[PDB]
């Protein structure tokens, strides 16, 4: 992350309230980390633009730059010609987090309730229960996004707090 040059720029501060309200964020430094990750990448893309065509440094690392972005889901298929990564936008990065993609796959009914789900040892990617909201989905585990075997809505245990309501009925109405 890094701080911007201007601390108080109103229409810039307008859209920061837009995205964080859209994507269910909690810090502006969370936005600043995404821009700083973009700041180094978009830096290095200009450097290969200064090199010749079919340059093997531009061929090897420039296409490995492509394959890392095709993996994470940001880069489309038709725009795979090294110029759309100069004409990008930051919301494509915010799209690829698993905090929103579980809501894009229904099931969350709020951008804020989804964050509540993540921190409570819910959805496993495969067998791996993840508790980090910044995963940057692999684009191939998207249909494998599903509940844990435990932590109900994935079942196999009701959990003790449902067992209290089980105990509050079975002992009061029962014995």
């Amino acid at each position: 992350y890094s701080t911007p040059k201007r601390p108080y720029e109103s229409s810039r501060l307008d859209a920061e309230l837009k995205l964080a309200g859209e994507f269910g964020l909690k810090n502006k430094k969370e936005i600043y980390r995404i821009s700083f990750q973009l700041s180094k990448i978009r830096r290095a893309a200009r450097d290969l633009l200064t090199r010749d065509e079919k340059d093997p440094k531009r061929l090897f690392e420039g296409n490995a730059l492509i394959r890392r972005l095709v993996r994470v889901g940001v880069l489309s298929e038709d725009k795979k010609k090294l110029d759309y990564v100069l004409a990008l936008k930051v919301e494509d990065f915010l799209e690829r987090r698993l905090q929103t993609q579980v809501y894009k796959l229904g099931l969350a009914k709020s951008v804020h309730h989804a964050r509540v789900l993540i921190t409570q040892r819910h959805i496993a990617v495969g067998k791996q229960i993840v508790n980090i909201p910044s995963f940057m989905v692999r684009l191939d585990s998207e249909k494998h996004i599903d509940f844990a075997p435990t932590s109900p809505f994935g079942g196999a245990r009701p959990g003790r707090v449902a067992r209290r309501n089980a105990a509050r009925k079975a002992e009061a109405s029962g014995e």
């Binding site: 309230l17 837009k18 909690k26 804020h112 964050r115």
Partner: peptide
């Protein structure tokens, strides 16, 4: 020490403004 603050913190503090701005900008853009 003042017992005045009851208003939300952090994410819920972030929650209230976007609900307000959705009410505000919709009549503003119209």
């Amino acid at each position: 020490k003042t017992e005045k603050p009851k208003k939300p913190k952090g994410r819920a503090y972030k929650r209230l403004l976007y609900t307000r701005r959705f009410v505000n900008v919709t009549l503003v853009n119209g």
